[PDB]
Amino acid sequence: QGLAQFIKVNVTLENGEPVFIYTDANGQVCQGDITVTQAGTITYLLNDQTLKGLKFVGVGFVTPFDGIIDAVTISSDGMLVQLVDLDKTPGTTKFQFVLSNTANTLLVLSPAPQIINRP
Amino acid sequence: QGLAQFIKVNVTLENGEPVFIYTDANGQVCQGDITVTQAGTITYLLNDQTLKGLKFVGVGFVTPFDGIIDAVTISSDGMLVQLVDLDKTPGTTKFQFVLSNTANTLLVLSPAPQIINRP
Amino acid sequence: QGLAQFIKVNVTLENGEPVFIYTDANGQVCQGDITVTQAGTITYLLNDQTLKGLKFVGVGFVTPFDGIIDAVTISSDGMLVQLVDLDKTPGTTKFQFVLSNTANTLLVLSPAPQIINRP
Amino acid sequence: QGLAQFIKVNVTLENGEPVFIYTDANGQVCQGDITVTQAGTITYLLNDQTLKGLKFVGVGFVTPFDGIIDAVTISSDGMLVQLVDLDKTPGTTKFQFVLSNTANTLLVLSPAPQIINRP
Amino acid sequence: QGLAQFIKVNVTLENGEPVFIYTDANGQVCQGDITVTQAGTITYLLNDQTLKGLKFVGVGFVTPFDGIIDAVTISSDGMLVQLVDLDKTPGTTKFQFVLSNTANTLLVLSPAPQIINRP
């Protein structure tokens, strides 16, 4: 077993464009990098306040073969994505959320890469 | 946050037909019902030893609106499915795994419904 | 050639949960097992009265390699599924309908397995 | 109920390009138009001998709202497609098979439209 | 590099059935065959005025291995399809648009094959 973490992915529009605000369980804006020690899951819940019909389509990595995150799971409605760590690979990785929208056929990327860390 | 549980779903064939054997972290065959207390995730990992190209396609419920499990997530390769409990609804639910195979176009169901419990 | 049978799959909600009522051509509630003699097709038509956006996603079997039903076909809108018997394999099989819904990401299973028989 | 008809769709290549040969149950090459009297199903089974990885993706009509065929169902492996007549609409319609292939991203169309007739 | 051509695919209904009207940049109805000299792209934009929820699903060819068009690309919303010529294969090919609709599960085919020519 391990730890199940939950983060909410709030998306609003400012000047026509997406803004991503991450909140934890206690409705605090999330500060800094995710440090993982146990194996486990990080579940991201989409709160789309854009009116652009956003859905998760996956989570993107520049270094996808680094083994830090072992798998990604996604719900059929695109409202949840999970990062899965099965084997506790040490190191650091960075990722961006990838979303579809209903206004156009471009995919949407979260701008600031999220960092996950295992000491 | 909550608890991340991991169960392996071993599938073999006996007399031409699937047999599902569930194992926990310590490689023990799983005994009894899953009792949940915290919110969290249960991750199921497919170990297909059938040669029939099995993939998870989802998790089926006879009472899908009971709120016990709030969501299901699935990996793109059909090797992982997760049950997600966000809001800790009390009660009991039963489910079966639903899989595709490459030998024919029938879906595969796990026979013995798995039971999840919150006191 | 063979026989084309048609059954309607009425789904309503009772106490928040699905109830499946099968009707034949003459609007009679269906009684007993389907006995097949010729090759052919059984077409199931979804009449979703749940307001939960149900769609067929396939038909599930605990013994999918038994050869009784040889294939399943599905319409693009999930309103029809067909069981196909090409080679008249003798014996008995049991199955459940598997449906998606728009309220949540859990799959829906029909509870009472339908039985198909060839003497 | 009605009649379940089965036709095999043999595809070979001649001078690099697809040739469609239809055969009935008795392995006779199919002659003329399909005349339907009862409601029912026509099941088409793909026998791809092209080495181009052909799969049915649907059945195309120039007059899709004519009501002659009421629905199309397709198997998950693209090896079967069925035309469904639920309500016995009188008249004549024409259609072509639409297939994907693994050599390129163009869809494949059967050349000679198949005609279905109800007097 | 090459030439990017754009054609609009207007679809209306007459007597219940689709009518395809092609217009060029200057809103002229398109006359004759497309003669290509350079490599390049032909982009088709769907203007669906049918109320039948039409979407491109691909472009169909009776002679898909002729090499005249090398690839087809499609937008996620089915509003654009492109024919791609990478290697300037000489000759002539014919094609039809293949569309889904939301009224029924039959695919829709454009009737008059469009001809593309390279001298």
Next chain:
Amino acid sequence: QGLAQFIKVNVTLENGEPVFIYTDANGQVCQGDITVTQAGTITYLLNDQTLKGLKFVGVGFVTPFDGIIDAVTISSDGMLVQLVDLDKTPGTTKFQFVLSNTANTLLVLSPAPQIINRP
């Protein structure tokens, strides 16, 4: 009409991880930003030399509603993606390629955002 540009997206692995090398028609490594003046298409062709089964799944933007690129089209095999400019919106946008792979369920992102410019 407009200009059809073609760029090849070569992907290799260095130290286990993807490296993206862009080449133009004349097999030159691509230098600087794409400056567009006419409407048109930019076609990207995937040359995957990673052995990780890469496929395009789309093109991601941090500012997807900026109108610089109006649409994205993708081939069914994920070997081609196209950026489409229909209405010549002035300004600058940045994007990354988003790819699936067959080794794991993480999406792959190209690291250095590509810049497109209209003066």
